[PDB]
């Protein structure tokens, strides 16, 4: 779902660019200003990424913990299944 | 495009806040473990643990 959303965003840009190009050709306003602002707002992320890296590490650790918990419950389930099988055999 | 952005936006505003949601997902994780222990309730605990993991995964994807 996230991917589809991202694609939609990029799609707008692509189409937007095409429109701009055509617009310029014809010319040869507000939208332009808006675009400029967006531009000013990955490059910058570079320095910001430094921090993101630290936070990514934290959220990786959390995921690992969750995985462990899941494994625990999984083991219990397996044990239960085994017990059931044994009971059936006895019957 | 808006719909997609909306989802992303939420992802972003969660990433600002995640330090408190971390500490409440840490507790939840512990709760699940407690439940399982009792069973050895167990199902409930397991569900809680799964939820916590899911929340972590969603935090990673956003990042």
């Amino acid at each position: 779902i996230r991917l589809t959303n991202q694609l939609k965003s990029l799609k707008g840009l692509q189409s937007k660019l095409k429109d701009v190009v055509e617009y310029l050709d014809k010319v040869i306003h507000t939208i332009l200003g808006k675009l400029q602002d967006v531009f000013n707002l990955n490059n910058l992320q570079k320095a910001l990424t430094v921090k993101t890296n630290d936070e990514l590490m934290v959220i990786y650790i959390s995921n690992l913990v969750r995985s462990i918990i899941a494994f625990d419950d999984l083991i219990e389930n397996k044990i239960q299944n085994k017990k059931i099988q044994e009971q059936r055999v006895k019957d | 495009y808006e719909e997609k952005e909306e989802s992303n936006l939420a992802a972003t505003k969660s990433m600002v806040k995640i330090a408190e949601q971390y500490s409440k997902r840490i507790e939840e994780e512990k709760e699940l473990t407690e439940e399982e222990l009792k069973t050895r309730p167990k199902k409930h605990l397991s569900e809680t643990a799964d939820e916590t993991l899911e929340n972590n995964i969603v935090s990673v994807l956003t990042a």
Partner: peptide, 25 residues
Amino acid sequence: ATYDSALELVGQLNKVVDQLFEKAS
């Protein structure tokens, strides 16, 4: 704190595993 919390969770999980082993036996 995060790091410590994770450590605790791990412990709990270990306990659960031990319990399951009991039943298996």
